[PDB]
Amino acid sequence: VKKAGPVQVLIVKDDHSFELDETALNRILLSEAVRDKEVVAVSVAGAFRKGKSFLMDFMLRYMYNQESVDWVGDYNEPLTGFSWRGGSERETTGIQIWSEIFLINKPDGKKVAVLLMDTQGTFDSQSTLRDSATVFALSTMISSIQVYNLSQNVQEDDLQHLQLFTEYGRLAMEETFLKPFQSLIFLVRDWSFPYEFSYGADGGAKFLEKRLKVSGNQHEELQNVRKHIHSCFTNISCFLLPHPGLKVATNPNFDGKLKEIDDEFIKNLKILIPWLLSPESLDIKEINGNKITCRGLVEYFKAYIKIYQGEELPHPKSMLQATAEANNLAAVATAKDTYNKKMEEICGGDKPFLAPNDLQTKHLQLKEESVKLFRGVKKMGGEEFSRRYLQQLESEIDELYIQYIKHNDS
Ligand SMILES: Nc1nc2c(ncn2[C@@H]2O[C@H](COP(=O)(O)OP(=O)(O)O)[C@@H](O)[C@H]2O)c(=O)[nH]1
Ligand SMILES: [Mg+2]
Incomplete structure (x- = not known):
């Protein structure tokens, strides 16, 4: 019809x-x-x-x-x-x-x-x-x-x-x-x-x-x-x-x-x-x-x-999103690394069991230095985008610090 x-x-x-x-x-x-x-x-x-x-x-x-x-x-x-x-x-x-x-x-x-x-x-x-x-x-x-x-x-x-x-x-x-x-x-x-x-x-x-x-x-x-x-x-x-x-x-x-x-x-x-x-x-x-x-x-x-x-x-992820994300995780990683290397450089190894007071001030110093390191570096997101990554770096450094107090209380 x-x-x-x-x-x-x-x-x-x-x-x-x-x-x-x-x-x-x-x-x-x-x-x-x-x-x-x-x-x-x-x-x-x-x-x-x-x-x-x-x-x-x-x-x-x-x-x-x-x-x-x-x-x-x-x-x-x-x-x-x-x-x-x-x-x-x-x-x-x-x-x-x-x-x-x-x-x-x-x-x-x-x-x-x-x-x-x-x-x-x-x-x-x-x-x-x-x-x-x-x-x-x-x-x-x-x-x-x-x-x-x-x-x-x-x-x-x-x-x-x-x-x-x-x-x-x-x-x-x-x-x-x-x-x-x-x-x-x-x-x-x-x-x-x-x-x-x-x-x-x-x-x-x-x-x-x-x-x-x-x-x-x-x-x-x-x-x-x-x-x-x-x-x-x-x-x-x-x-x-x-x-x-x-x-x-x-x-x-x-x-x-x-x-x-x-x-x-x-x-x-x-x-x-x-x-x-x-x-x-x-x-x-x-x-x-x-x-x-x-x-x-x-x-x-x-x-x-x-x-x-x-x-x-799977939802596709764009190139611009992907490469920006990567650029920030690298900043994150670089800063974590530097924090970590210096934390064993300082506190072993058990080395000298350190006063939780003294270990803490060395942690805040180092966290600041690597947070400062995390900015100043060129990042694609723009501030609002990189803020989330800055939290990431702090979140992870803290967790990486909790482990470091165990190793010390020995
Ligand atoms: N430049 C170019 N235009 C074409 C070609 N074939 C069709 N057109 C014209 O491009 C427009 C879109 O054509 P249409 O077949 O409806 O596109 P469709 O949505 O992919 O089906 C129409 O004006 C066509 O007359 C082609 O091979 N090259
Ligand atoms: Mg058609």
Whole structure:
């Protein structure tokens, strides 16, 4: 009673709560016509306004029209037909699936159910990071190709976010000799240095090599991005997509003829889409080595959500917070150290059991000297932030002093 279209299946409300739409999820992947078929699950995932819907709009044009030279459409007429682009576009965090599941014939002769999802999150604060990261983990767990839609390059935060949500994924799942996830494509959206690396998969491949080999190693432990990434996915690639031109770029709801999109962009879109979605390359989802059915998929999805709802996912700590904290603990540690070294320098060892009166005055002297030491030193927090650490130093020195009176009363 309604055309085919995009439907919200997972959303994160202001409550920071994850709202799963069971009946919507059921009505779509528990249709008898599909419920028992092996499912290929393709996901485009990224921040808001990164061009995902536009890309998936062409994906639909292909999925609906397996015919030569039309799948892209008529060079002289606008884009038309089914669309993920809804108009009054709210920024939201979650997953949309295309309501129409496609049945497609493989080279083997299998009839697979092809599932298309949009995976979206916002990254504007350490609070929304947690939510996006768990929405991206769920997406990647439930999909067989995760096309990670990035904008100009692969920035440090892009990789950090990728590790963080694969990390979240690993938590909710039991470890095996197999890799936790299948495919991952770094899709770079507005590549503008073709003279360095080419538009496309050849060129992308090369670029991702250089990027991953830097950092290089990070972050601090020997958990460097390349190893981490490669140990999570079975296949990793990267496509370099050109800029679509100013009309597409500055026009929300673009609606001009195909001809007004940049020619190099259409040309590469023409190879990218089938590169991902052609019957040959279509790739059946599997978990623990076993191919999944649309129904199987639904049960894992409900299941995975259950787990994350039960236990708490680690809250991310920002770089600025982390490095400030560290800078202050070092001040704290330096000052404690100096206090301690001098306290045994003075009072052993038992040395001369000292009048609790005399030991105390040596303690106050030394505490003051190391508290004075604790200020004067450059610290990132700002006074209000470092005050807490100053308490820390006093709290700890006192405790380190209580031990020193025992050793003395001997
Ligand atoms: N610069 C650039 N803009 C794009 C691209 N694809 C779409 N756009 C435009 O960017 C805006 C956001 O597009 P949209 O697909 O709705 O972004 P989404 O929220 O990630 O789905 C729209 O004006 C699009 O016409 C692209 O590859 N590069
Ligand atoms: Mg969108």
